[PDB]
């Protein structure tokens, strides 16, 4: 359903985002090129995304229960992301992420459980 995917480097910087994700967030391709992994992450969620970044690179998978990504209009879009390392050859190559939109009341309910 309203789930979208995005490709990232191992440092979490954006490589690609599907059209559904760009419609939800409101950004064009030129606005997301060479965009850092924490660029649009809410200040209150920097440490949380950072720890899931460490779990991802050490284990190969990670799950972010609820965090905030700033939309182009200024509003905050709560997300629920599942990250995984994709292997080219037999080395970690890039990161694939599967997100899901969350309502404001839903993301704030998960804030105390993440």
Residue numbers in the entry: 268 to 381
What does the paper say about this structure?
The aryl hydrocarbon receptor (AHR), a member of the basic helix–loop–helix (bHLH) Per–Arnt–Sim (PAS) family of transcription factors, plays important roles in regulating xenobiotic metabolism, cellular differentiation, stem cell maintenance, as well as immunity. From the N- to C-terminus, AHR comprises a basic helix-loop-helix (bHLH) domain for DNA binding, two tandemly arranged PAS domains (termed PAS-A and PAS-B) for dimerization, and a transcription activation domain12. The ligand binding site of AHR has been mapped to its PAS-B domain. Here, we present multiple crystal structures of the Drosophila AHR PAS-B domain, including its apo, ligand-bound, and AHR nuclear translocator (ARNT) PAS-B-bound forms.
Only the PAS-B domain of Drosophila AHR (dAHR) is soluble. We then performed crystallographic studies on purified dAHR PAS-B. Diffraction-qualified crystals were successfully obtained, and the structure was determined at a resolution of 2.6 Å. Topologically, dAHR PAS-B is arranged as βA-βB-αC-αD-αE-βF-βG-βH-βI-αJ and resembles a baseball catcher’s mitt, with the six β-strands forming the palm and three helices (αC, αD and αE) forming the opposing thumb. Next, we compared our dAHR PAS-B structure with the previously reported PAS-B structure of hypoxia-inducible factor-2α (HIF-2α), as the latter is also a bHLH-PAS protein capable of binding ARNT and whose activity can be modulated by synthesized molecules. Although the overall folding was similar, superimposing the two structures gave a root-mean-square deviation (rmsd) of 4.5 Å over 106 equivalent Cα atoms, which indicated comparable differences. The C-termini adopt opposite conformations in the two structures, with dAHR PAS-B folding into a helix (αJ), while HIF-2α presents as a loop. In addition, part of the residues between αE and αD folded into a short helix (αD’) in HIF-2α, while this helix was not observed in dAHR PAS-B. Other minor differences are observed within the αE, βH, αC and αD regions. These observations suggest that dAHR PAS-B has a similar overall fold while adopting some unique features compared to HIF-2α PAS-B. CASTp39 assigns 440 Å3 and 680 Å3 cavity volumes for dAHR PAS-B and mAHR PAS-B, respectively. Combined with the fact that the activation of dAHR is constitutive and ligand-independent, we infer that dAHR PAS-B might be in an intrinsically active conformation.
